[PDB]
Design a protein around this ligand. Structure first.
Ligand code: FAD
Ligand code: NCA
Ligand code: MG
Length: 309
């Protein structure tokens, strides 16, 4: 039924690891695999990178790894490159179920001249292309792990978790959902509701869709999954279908779940948040509620979890 994971001593630590490796002495990890997650119509490549850390850089679900790309710091001669953070997309056991690997979900940052569409190697994103250009056996300078905002609250195994992602913001939720549904973790038997909302540009830009869809058939009473394909669908007002439009489609259900104590999570590019806030204010107003009052309450109750950049 559930997949055996090892070693179960990874459940014993009472606190998440933080800054085990630091930039001046990173951990030299080894690439296991790199693959594209997306199809030909996707605006850009997003890749799935599996990294062998040998058990030397454990983490909890929701944390980030740092990666120091090669080369000198362009603004600090003689110095290494600045760390880039990546949300870990794997559980603490990893994609090999052995506690030795972790995975990243990385969008290639590529520069196009806004008029001609021409390229320029010196303007592409350094660390994202480094990662998606990697091959098995390549070495990676790893730092961290870091972050606590997106730790999964496990005190109540029957909690409700409403997960709102755009693009690579799905990464921590892939980790959450594997821990909730896929892996045999005897000390955490999830029996609540986990509701994943994912916005991407088009069907070819979907990330891990087969995995999430499988949870609908395995855990129909504990998982829901809704997608917004912005260039392929339009909202009720003529706009491109964004994730906030999908929340709006379920406004009454979601607001009732929040009032009942649900956690809600937001992850991805910071550009996703203004439209979400606009939708939530409009929804609140139609219900005769104040979104300001409601958000202040959610934050005070520690139901509101945002990590965007
Ligand atoms: C907590 C956290 C978690 C994150 N999680 C993820 C994740 O899971 N996945 C993910 O893909 N990203 C994630 N990010 C973003 C990630 O950390 C990087 O910032 C991103 O990958 C870009 O880094 P880079 O080294 O590729 O680009 P950089 O080399 O830092 O360049 C940044 C941008 O500037 C552009 N640029 C460079 N030079 C020029 C120029 N001369 N003219 C115009 N433009 C230029 C680049 O093309 C790029 O878009 C996260 C960020 C944070 C803070
Ligand atoms: N955790 C983050 O801030 C994040 C994740 C994915 C993409 N961009 C930022
Ligand atoms: Mg696909």
């Amino acid at each position: 039924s559930k997949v055996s994971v090892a070693p179960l001593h990874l459940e014993s630590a009472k606190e998440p690891p933080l800054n085990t490796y630091k930039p001046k002495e990173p951990f030299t990890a080894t690439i296991v695999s790199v693959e594209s997650l997306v199809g030909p119509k996707a605006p850009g490549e997003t890749c799935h990178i599996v990294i062998d850390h040998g058990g030397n850089v454990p983490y909890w679900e929701g944390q980030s790894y740092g990666v120091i790309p090669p080369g000198e710091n362009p603004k600090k001669p003689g110095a290494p490159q600045n760390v880039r953070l990546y949300s870990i997309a794997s559980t603490r056991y990893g994609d090999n179920f052995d506690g030795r690997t972790g995975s990243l979900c990385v969008r290639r940052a590529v520069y196009y001249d806004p008029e001609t569409g021409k390229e320029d190697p010196s303007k592409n994103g350094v660390c994202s292309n480094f990662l998606c250009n990697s091959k098995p056996g390549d070495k990676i300078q790893l730092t961290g792990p870091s972050g606590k905002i997106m730790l999964l609250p496990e005190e109540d195994p029957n909690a409700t978790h409403i997960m709102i992602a755009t693009g690579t913001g799905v990464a921590p939720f892939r980790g959450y959902l594997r821990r909730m549904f896929m892996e045999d973790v005897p000390n955490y038997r999830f029996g609540g509701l986990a509701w994943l909302f994912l916005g991407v540009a088009n069907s070819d830009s979907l990330l891990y869709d087969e995995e999430f869809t499988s949870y609908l058939k395995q855990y129909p009473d504990n998982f829901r999954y809704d997608k917004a394909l912005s260039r392929e669908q339009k909202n009720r007002s003529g706009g491109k279908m964004y994730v906030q439009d999908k929340i709006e489609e379920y406004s009454d259900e979601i607001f009732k779940l929040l009032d009942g104590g649900a956690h809600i999570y937001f992850c991805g590019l910071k550009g996703m948040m203004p439209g979400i806030q606009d939708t939530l204010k409009k929804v609140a107003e139609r219900r005769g509620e104040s979104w300001d009052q409601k958000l202040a309450q959610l934050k005070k109750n520690k139901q509101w979890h945002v990590e965007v950049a």
